[PDB]
């Protein structure tokens, strides 16, 4: 039977590298995912050590070779939320998107490129579903299934080399559009058409989206990466106003 510090580890219905972590003293229920420590240090730890909790990590237990990351259960992701709401009203979209952007700005200011930004990368911290956190543990909205909706112009043009931070901002643009409209801005099921529209920056913002929201979307989905807002700059965009330590313990 699997016991680590004062937690009992139990298999989860899925069981990727994730388990149930029950506190032996109280029955408090967390989640645990195990990683090689090298991988934890390189890919997970940076997120924990930002100044400000954008993750829901409670603590990390560092064994011999492996890191046991204990985190809070979440209350669903933003992909499922948009799907169930169809699309968000501007006031909610702005509240939630500001939390998303604040997370990314923090990351970028410590030289952390995410590279995998999507609505499913953000999850609710409570049952209220008013506060999002970054899914940092590597753990419907198009014409058909499997739209590569986060493909940027850089990744189609250039030669593979481009700005990580500016590519994340493109992803913030796709996310913002999708929050407000309920479909991705580039959503063709035919990849020829999709890639053509992405390279040429061709998408349509419905008329009823406010002027401040429309120019913010446009300011993120600029074809030229150098022309996009930085994540810090997004936080000061007039749209928002218009509508509005993790401990590490060693073990044997």
Catalytic residue set: 116
**Token pair 């053509």: residue:** 196
Q: How far apart are CA 205 and CA 217, in angstroms?
A: 9
Taking the CA of residue 189 as centre, how many other CA atoms within 13 Å lie in the half-sphere pointing to its CB?
A: 6
Relative to beta strand 3-4, strand 29-36 is: unpaired
Q: How far apart are CA 47 and CA 18, in angstroms?
A: 19
Query: Max CA-CA distance within the chain?
Result: 61
Distances (CA, A) of 22 to 3, 8, 168, 211, 213: 9, 5, 36, 49, 44
**Token pair 């609710």: residue:** 124
Residue 103 contacts residue 112 (beta carbons within 8 Å): no
Which pair of tokens denotes residue 225? Answer: 């990466």
Task: Report residue 138 CA to chain centroid gap.
Answer: 10
Residue 69 contacts residue 60 (beta carbons within 8 Å): yes
Size of the chain, expressed as the number of residues it contains? 252
């Amino acid at each position: 039977p699997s016991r680590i510090a004062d937690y009992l580890l139990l298999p989860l219905a899925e069981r990727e590298h994730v388990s149930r972590a029950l506190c032996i003293h109280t029955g408090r229920e967390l989640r645990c995912k195990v990683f090689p420590i090298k991988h934890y240090q390189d890919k997970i730890r940076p997120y924990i050590q930002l100044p400000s909790n954008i993750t829901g990590i409670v603590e990390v237990i560092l064994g011999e070779t492996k890191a046991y990351v204990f985190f809070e259960k979440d209350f669903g992701d933003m992909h499922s939320y948009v799907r169930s709401r169809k699309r968000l009203r501007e006031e909610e979209a702005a509240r939630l998107f500001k939390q998303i952007v604040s997370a990314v700005a923090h990351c970028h200011q410590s030289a952390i490129v995410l590279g995998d930004l999507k609505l499913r990368k953000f999850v609710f911290s409570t049952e209220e579903r008013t506060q999002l956190r970054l899914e940092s543990l590597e753990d419907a909205l198009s014409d058909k299934h499997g739209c590569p909706a986060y493909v940027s112009p850089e990744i189609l043009n250039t030669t593979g080399t481009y700005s990580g931070k500016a590519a994340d901002v493109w992803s913030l643009g796709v996310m913002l559009y999708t929050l407000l409209v309920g479909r991705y801005p580039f959503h063709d099921s035919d990849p020829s058409a999709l890639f053509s529209k992405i390279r040429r920056g061709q998408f349509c913002i419905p008329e009823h989206i406010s002027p401040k929201a429309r120019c913010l979307i446009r300011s993120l989905l600029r074809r030229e990466p150098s022309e996009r807002l930085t994540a810090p700059e997004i936080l000061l965009h007039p749209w928002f106003e218009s509508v509005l330590i993790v401990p590490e313990y060693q073990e044997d």
